[PDB]
Design a protein around this ligand. Structure first.
Ligand SMILES: NC(=O)C1=CN([C@@H]2O[C@H](COP(=O)(O)OP(=O)(O)OC[C@H]3O[C@@H](n4cnc5c(N)ncnc54)[C@H](OP(=O)(O)O)[C@@H]3O)[C@@H](O)[C@H]2O)C=CC1
Ligand code: SF4
Ligand code: SF4
Ligand code: FES
Ligand SMILES: [Zn+2]
Lengths: 330, 687, 90, 185, 116, 71, 99
């Protein structure tokens, strides 16, 4: 049992040692900040450059944020990283492929390895794994299918594991609103995909982090549950684009390219990546996996547990979450 | 010109007040009071090394020298009596030169080991040297050296630092009552201690290090742990004994570092017992810090306060309210005890009792169950009759005050009870309530002494409470009082010497058991830190919840364990045998997620069906005022004017069983004391 | 009178050592405590005296139900009648 | 030294406002009432034989025991006659004392500093905004009851992308060492 | 009014309602000097100190951890009560214990025992 | 032992306790000694005078060196 | 500009009214300063300011009233310059011992 030894805030104990795999990403910043604000110790395992977790160093007290260099393909290195861990958080996953890492390798195999190591190390009390909202075995997107398989194998190997399924997350370092704003500023228009009639439930990233913190603080009510996380109201892609354009105070402009030609445009990247030995530019917008995910709606199923069941209301996406887009005005 | 330290002068009679001049300003002083105290009244303090207010007078250090007019030589302030119209001066060049020379002579052989000396910043030699002595040293020859002495597991001795003030030689003679320490030798090199290897052993032996001005005698458990300036001192009281002696707890951070006495003329002048002084060590061992539940396998699993309270409430609701019993521990504040009583009563049970309370105890008279004479009255007493009590092992400060009275005026003290060793030449009258009845009937020379001796005192031990014939015992004692004029309109000599801190407050709140089979005919047991409740009596198929701070004896039987705060971590009201009620103060943070006793009682009540009407300690003390208003007058003694002679007697004869030793160790009596490693060492060595 | 223990679980008197208002309560508590404790032994009849508290009588019945009555302006007979009423109201 | 214009002032100054005077080698001292401080400083600045025409500084001292805890001290200098003088008054938290910005223009920043550190407000200050502490500071740091480490501390909050202010949670608490000797009195 | 000064002093409202203890620190038992007595202190009962996980230091979170013992020294209990009432926090004054002077004599040190 | 392991974790080099136990006692003819720390009094510790009537070696309490009387 | 202490309750009331006027006129500037237009409710902000003034009625000393108004004007300038069922007892009990 974790024991709290302080009032709270910075320079406390909170009795939690959380190893946050994938803490250098978009959500890693917020989850590590929340954990360090709790007063807990955060082990940040970083893959490559030594300056990747640099910012994560400043959000915790002295010695609370510990960066560890590892090899994701090294079981011994993963075990060494998870040696002092008390709870484990998994955020590892990339929106695209690379000649080294495919969708299956970056999500399913890594989730299986993390679950196996957590099961072997009996000191782990909580295992919170993050996937996508549309992660289903029948989902058209390969990445969504891989995340669904990863969540299934995490449940199978480690029943004492909570699975969060947030929808698309917007924030200062998001990968949808920022590319849309950059495209709008550079070319004066943004490409809608299948006339933008599909619907999503974008969710605020600090809200997702607070949801994860509440899941960690649960008194044993969510040991083996899956929590679907979404925004207050359903936004169509066109509505989200209009909100973005209103926030930047620019005139909206759309082309609404059809799905077949969009898939044709995004197709050559995969074959080129599998062929050439040098890396290709990452697809910020023209991503075949993003197209495949956009083929079907990604909203809450009304059956699985949501923000209301967890205990925190989602934030409306007009003014608090989109305040970062002001820097994009003029 | 206020007196030094705000001191109040005691005039034997207003007629006797001579006018003595100190530094030009005249003051009124009693006749026999000395020059040092004359200047103390005037408001100026004089350096002193071999003078203690409680101890006798000796001119060992010769440093309290002042210039009195019409006198060729400087006179010792601590010894010269004050005469009418005497012109005393302390700031003259003669006095300053005398002080400087005496300081130089004191420091000419003092070792240069202040940095390793544990008296850094609290050494009278250092402060008086920096205030009155010179800033240089003319001595550069060979010093003197003394080998160290082994004086027990409490007093570490570095005899090179001793200035031979004989303050501890006459302390063991006068206050402690055991004559082992002595000044043996002659000349510049004279040693102090025992000729043979004799570890000093006494209840007050801890005070020897306190009065040593230099770091010659120091607390061994606190050998080199910390300095003085680091420690923050909180003024609190002690719970190991029922004296309620005032203490100061010095702590450095989250842990208690030492315990020292503090002045309270009504309870303990400046002294402290070994158990009280060294009980701090047990506060860091075997300390419960998490609510726990005993699973089916018999091992404890740590759970949340919510889960623990929920399971306790469910089990309490499951059983019928008739077989529900509540036991208050040896140490417990009135807030926790009243909260426990209210919770159990609202659960439908009337079986709440405190530790050390008999089945049939007439707790309806405070004059019946407290020390009516008070400690000052014990000072004023002339003859003592100690029945069923051994003050040397319980209420060591009361024993010290009895010894002081015996020394001050020859008191014919008679003792009835088990064989024991005293230090004030007692007379062993007998070992039997039958002998007590003989004294009551009046066919006894000690009854004759009590009858023809003014100001008599009869002290009944609180171990009589556990007896079945306590009503007959108290009837006999009341007969003694009636036929010896012990209870007078201006003097009350009846006293009951309680031996537990929570006993007085428990009796005030009315925590008395209702049946003999109460503990062994109950299905739900609530042990409020009761580690001496005879766990084998409780049936095996009984749900036991132990609300405590140290895991000593009841944890192995409890089904649920609740961690709380000790006396040094909570603000709680206690009452002493004298009748004075006083509050402890929070010195150090609580250990783990342990809440207050009354706090967890109220939370458990709210979790259960019946919620206690109070949410703050202010409302708790309001409820305490409602039930017994004598516990809401902090540091105030409330006399009980109703006589104890109104209590009826139900047993017509006393039992033949002799008085037993209720306290067998004095070094392992409470939970903290038993958990104290240094006190265990003291029990092993000094017994 | 001899059946206080039938309903009352614990009786309490609270007064002052030398208050004028509590003067009438002291004789009552003396004599009546003697005679009742002669009658019913198991009943606690606790007596408490403070510096300035108003003279009052508390009766605690089962399930921890407390009823208090002020005795500041009642004579001995009135206090006895009030105690009998408290016993009967249990 | 140079106790000439001090004695001359006590000889010539009106006796109505001289509450008390101190003749010391540590500095000649005048203590007056807050009502007449402006008039007293105007007399000293303008008189031809006590020309303290330069204001050295204004200081505040906190005395929690006294009814009027704050003590406002004015150190002035006379370069023409080469001597320093001291004029002080007593003020509490709420009462406003007269300002001497009109006489000595340098007094504005010292009076703002006194406001900042203690809370003694001035009557005729052109402005009385805080000068030394952080924007939005809530307490008065130089009061004795004010804790040494303050009430709040700042840090960078990544989600807010700004430096936020939070209640103090500092590690390695201040260790107050009680060195005072019982024989010093 | 008892509390206006505190409510306008800028102290955070959460710290303006807390029980404090007003007491005169007693003389140290280690030494007999009486120059550190007669002063009165406000005892902010702030015991929330823990151990720093990295270096084992004594952390704290209460701003009033040491100010009452370090900076706030009052001339008298009346002054301390006035300060506490001005600043609004609840207070409880602890009675100070005072030594009692009695006549002592070296002649009584050498007393004569009675006849055998 | 416990104290050494509490302040040090190397447990590979020799702790100061072992070195100071390994240095032999210093035999002196006189009954009293002057313990200074090293050959230069100004670079050692405050002077400590040690009594040597007890048969066992006496620790200096500064730079503890265990002086022993000759006869 | 700072003014001498108010010698009358009517003068203190007039100063309070002037300060409330200043707050009301400076409210729309705070709108562009902070940009919380979604759930600001300028009317609710005015109501909250009035509620603060109304909870500060227990004060009766004109000096305290003037000091409070001075600090309120200072706070206004700072804001303009952009410087930011289990009963209550059981929740605190489950949280920590110090409550
Ligand atoms: N698009 C979105 O924002 C949404 C995402 N999700 C889910 O949440 C997960 C986390 O999202 P998010 O943090 O925002 O995205 P990121 O891609 O920014 O976070 C992943 C982190 O892991 C690292 N990483 C990436 N690939 C590997 C690899 N092969 N081996 C080791 N480390 C790797 C990343 O870079 P580095 O190596 O430099 O540390 C980064 O630090 C996603 O994978 C997805 O399943 C759910 C809803 C919306
Ligand atoms: S008592 Fe002596 S050895 Fe100890 S510090 Fe003081 S002057 Fe030095
Ligand atoms: S050991 Fe201490 S108290 Fe005893 S004579 Fe020596 S200096 Fe005095
Ligand atoms: S104190 Fe008087 S001679 Fe020592
Ligand atoms: Zn040495």
């Amino acid at each position: 049992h974790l024991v709290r030894k302080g009032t709270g805030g910075r320079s406390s104990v909170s009795g939690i040692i959380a190893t946050v795999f994938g803490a250098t990403g978009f959500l890693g910043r917020y989850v590590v900040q929340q954990l360090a604000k709790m007063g807990s110790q955060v082990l940040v395992p970083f893959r490559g450059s030594e300056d990747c977790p640099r910012h994560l160093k400043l959000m915790g007290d002295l010695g609370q944020i510990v960066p560890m260099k590892y090899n994701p393909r090294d079981e011994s290195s993963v075990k060494a990283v998870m040696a002092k861990a008390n709870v484990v958080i998994n955020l590892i996953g990339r929106d695209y492929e690379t000649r080294n890492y495919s969708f299956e390798e970056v999500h399913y195999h890594m989730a299986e390895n993390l679950a196996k190591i957590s099961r072997e190390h009996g000191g782990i009390l909580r295992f919170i794994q993050v996937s996508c909202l549309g992660a289903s075995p029948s989902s058209p997107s390969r990445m969504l299918r891989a995340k669904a398989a990863a969540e299934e194998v995490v449940l199978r190997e480690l029943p004492e594991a909570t699975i969060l399924k947030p929808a698309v997350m917007i924030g200062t370092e998001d990968r949808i609103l920022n590319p849309w704003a950059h495209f709008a500023k550079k070319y004066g228009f943004i490409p809608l995909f299948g006339n933008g009639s599909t619907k999503i439930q974008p969710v605020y990233v600090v809200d997702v982090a607070a949801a994860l913190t509440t899941v960690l603080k649960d008194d044993g009510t969510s040991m083996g549950k899956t929590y679907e996380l979404g925004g207050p109201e359903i936004f169509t892609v066109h509505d989200l684009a209009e909100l973005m354009y209103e926030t930047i105070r620019e005139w909206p402009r759309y082309v609404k390219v059809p799905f077949p030609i969009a898939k044709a445009l995004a197709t050559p990247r995969e074959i080129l990546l599998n062929k050439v030995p040098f890396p290709l530019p990452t697809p910020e917008i023209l991503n075949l996996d993003k197209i495949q995910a956009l083929t079907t709606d990604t909203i809450v199923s009304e059956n699985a547990l949501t923000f209301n069941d967890l205990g925190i209301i989602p934030h409306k996406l007009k003014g608090y979450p989109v305040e970062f887009l002001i820097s994009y005005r003029k | 010109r206020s007196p030094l330290a705000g001191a109040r002068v005691h005039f034997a009679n207003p007629d006797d007040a001579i006018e003595v001049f100190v530094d030009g300003y005249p003051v009124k002083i009693p006749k026999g009071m000395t020059v040092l105290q004359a200047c103390e009244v005037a408001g100026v303090d004089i350096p002193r090394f071999c003078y203690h207010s409680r101890l006798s007078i000796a001119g060992n250090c010769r440093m309290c020298l002042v210039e009195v007019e019409k006198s060729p030589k400087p006179v010792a302030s601590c010894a010269m009596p004050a005469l009418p119209g005497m012109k005393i001066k302390t700031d003259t060049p003669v006095a300053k030169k005398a002080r400087e020379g005496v300081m130089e002579f004191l420091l000419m052989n003092h070792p240069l080991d202040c940095p390793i000396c544990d008296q850094g910043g609290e050494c009278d030699l250092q402060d008086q040297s920096m205030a009155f002595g010179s800033d240089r040293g003319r001595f550069t020859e060979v010093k003197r050296s003394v080998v160290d002495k082994n004086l027990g597991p409490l007093v570490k001795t570095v005899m090179t630092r001793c200035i031979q003030c004989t303050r501890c030689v006459r302390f063991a003679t006068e206050v402690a009552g055991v004559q082992d320490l002595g000044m043996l030798g002659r000349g510049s090199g004279e040693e102090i201690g025992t000729y043979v290897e004799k570890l000093l052993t006494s209840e007050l032996s801890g005070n020897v290090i306190d009065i040593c001005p230099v770091g010659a005698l120091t607390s061994k458990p606190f050998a080199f742990k910390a300095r003085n300036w680091e420690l923050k001192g909180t003024e609190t009281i002690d719970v190991t004994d029922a004296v309620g002696s005032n203490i100061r707890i010095d702590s450095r951070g989250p842990e208690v570092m030492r315990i020292v006495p503090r002045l309270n003329e009504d309870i303990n002048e400046e002294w402290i017992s070994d158990k009280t002084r060294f009980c701090y060590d047990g506060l860091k061992r075997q300390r419960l810090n998490d609510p726990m539940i005993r699973g089916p396998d018999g091992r404890f699993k740590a759970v949340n306060w919510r889960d623990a309270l929920s399971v306790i409430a469910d089990i309490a609701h499951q059983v019928k309210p008739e077989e529900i019993v509540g036991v208050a521990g040896k140490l417990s504040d009135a807030e926790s005890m009243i909260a426990l009583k209210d919770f159990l009563n609202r659960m439908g049970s009337n079986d709440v009792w405190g530790e050390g309370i008999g089945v049939n105890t007439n707790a309806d008279f405070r004059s019946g169950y407290i020390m009516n004479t008070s400690i000052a009255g014990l000072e004023k007493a002339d003859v003592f009759l100690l029945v069923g009590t051994q003050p040397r092992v319980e209420a060591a400060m009361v024993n010290a005050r009895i010894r002081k009275t015996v020394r001050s005026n020859q008191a014919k003290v008679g003792y009835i009870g088990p064989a024991t060793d005293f230090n004030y030449d007692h007379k062993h009258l007998g070992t039997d309530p039958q002998t007590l009845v003989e004294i009551a009937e009046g066919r006894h020379p000690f009854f004759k002494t009590l009858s023809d001796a003014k100001n008599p005192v009869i002290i009944v031990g609180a171990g009589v409470f556990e007896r079945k014939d306590q009503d007959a015992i108290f009837a006999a004692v009341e007969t003694i009082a009636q036929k010896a004029n012990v209870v007078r309109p201006d003097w009350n000599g009846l006293n009951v010497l309680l031996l537990h801190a929570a006993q007085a407050a428990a009796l005030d709140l009315g925590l008395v058991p209702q049946s003999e089979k109460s503990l062994e005919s109950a299905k739900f047991v609530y042990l409020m830190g009761a580690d001496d409740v005879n766990l084998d009596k409780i049936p095996d198929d009984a749900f036991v919840v132990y609300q405590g701070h140290h895991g000593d004896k009841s944890v192995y039987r409890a089904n649920v364990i609740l961690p709380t705060a000790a006396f040094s971590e909570k603000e709680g009201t206690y009452q002493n045998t004298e009748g004075c009620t006083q509050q402890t103060l929070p010195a150090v943070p609580t250990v783990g997620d342990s809440r207050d006793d009354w706090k967890i009682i109220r939370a458990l009540s709210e979790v259960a069906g019946v919620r206690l009407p109070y949410d703050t300690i202010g409302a708790v003390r309001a409820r305490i005022r409602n039930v017994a208003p004598n516990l809401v007058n902090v540091d105030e003694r409330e006399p009980a004017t109703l006589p104890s002679s109104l209590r009826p007697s139900f047993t017509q004869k006393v039992d033949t069983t002799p008085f037993g030793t209720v306290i067998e160790n004095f070094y392992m009596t409470d939970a903290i004391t038993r958990a104290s490693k240094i006190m265990a060492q003291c029990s092993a060595t000094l017994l | 009178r001899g059946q206080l223990s039938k309903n009352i679980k614990e009786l309490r008197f609270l007064m002052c050592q030398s208050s004028s208002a509590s003067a009438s309560a002291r004789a009552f508590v003396e004599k009546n405590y003697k005679e009742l404790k002669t009658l019913n032994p198991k009943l606690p009849i606790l007596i408490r005296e403070c510096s300035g508290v108003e003279p009052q009588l508390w009766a605690r019945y089962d399930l921890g139900v407390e009823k208090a009555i002020k005795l500041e302006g009642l004579s001995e007979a009135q206090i006895s009648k009030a105690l009998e009423d408290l016993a009967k109201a249990g | 030294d140079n106790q000439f214009i001090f004695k001359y002032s006590w000889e010539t100054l009106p006796k109505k406002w001289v509450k008390k005077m101190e003749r010391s080698e540590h500095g000649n001292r005048f203590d007056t009432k807050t009502d007449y401080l402006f008039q007293l400083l105007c007399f000293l600045k303008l008189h031809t034989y006590t020309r303290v025409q330069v204001l050295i500084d204004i200081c505040g001292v906190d005395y929690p025991s006294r009814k009027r805890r704050f003590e406002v001290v004015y150190n002035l200098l006379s370069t023409r006659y080469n001597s320093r003088i001291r004029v002080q008054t007593s003020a509490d938290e709420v009462t406003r004392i007269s300002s001497v910005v009109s006489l000595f223009p340098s007094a504005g920043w010292w009076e703002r500093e006194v406001w900042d550190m203690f809370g003694v407000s001035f009557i005729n200050h052109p402005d009385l905004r805080r000068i030394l502490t952080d924007y939005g500071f809530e307490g008065h740091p130089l009061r004795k009851d004010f804790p040494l480490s303050g009430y709040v501390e700042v840090r960078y909050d990544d989600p807010e992308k700004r430096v936020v202010s939070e209640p103090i949670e500092m590690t390695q608490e201040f260790r107050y060492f009680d060195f005072a000797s019982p024989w010093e009195q | 009014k008892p509390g206006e000064i505190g409510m306008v002093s800028g102290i955070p409202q959460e710290h303006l309602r807390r029980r404090v203890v007003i007491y005169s620190p007693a003389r140290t038992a280690s030494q007999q000097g009486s120059g550190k007595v007669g002063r009165w202190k406000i005892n902010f009962l702030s015991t929330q100190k823990w151990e720093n996980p990295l270096m084992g230091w004594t952390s704290t979170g209460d701003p009033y951890a040491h100010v009452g013992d370090s900076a706030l020294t009052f001339d008298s209990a009346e002054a301390a009560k006035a300060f506490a009432e001005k600043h609004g926090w609840e207070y409880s004054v602890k009675k100070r214990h005072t030594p009692l002077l009695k006549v002592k004599s070296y002649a009584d040190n050498f007393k004569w025992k009675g006849f055998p | 032992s416990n104290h050494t392991a509490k302040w040090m974790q190397d447990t590979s080099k020799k702790s100061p306790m072992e070195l100071i136990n390994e240095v032999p006692p210093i035999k002196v003819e006189g009954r009293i000694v002057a313990c200074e720390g090293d050959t230069n009094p100004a670079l050692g510790h405050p002077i400590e005078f040690i009594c040597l009537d007890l048969p066992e070696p006496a620790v200096c309490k500064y730079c503890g060196l265990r002086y022993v009387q000759d006869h | 500009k700072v003014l001498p202490n108010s010698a009358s309750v009517e003068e203190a009331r007039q100063r309070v009214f002037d300060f409330f006027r200043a707050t009301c006129r400076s409210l729309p500037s705070v709108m562009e300063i902070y940009n919380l237009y979604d759930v600001t409710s300028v009317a609710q902000l005015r109501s909250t300011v009035a509620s603060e003034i109304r909870k500060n009625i227990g004060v009766s000393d004109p000096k305290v009233i003037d000091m409070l108004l001075f600090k309120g004007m200072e706070e206004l300038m700072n804001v303009v310059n952009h410087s930011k069922a289990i009963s209550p007892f059981l929740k605190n009990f489950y949280s920590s011992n110090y409550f």
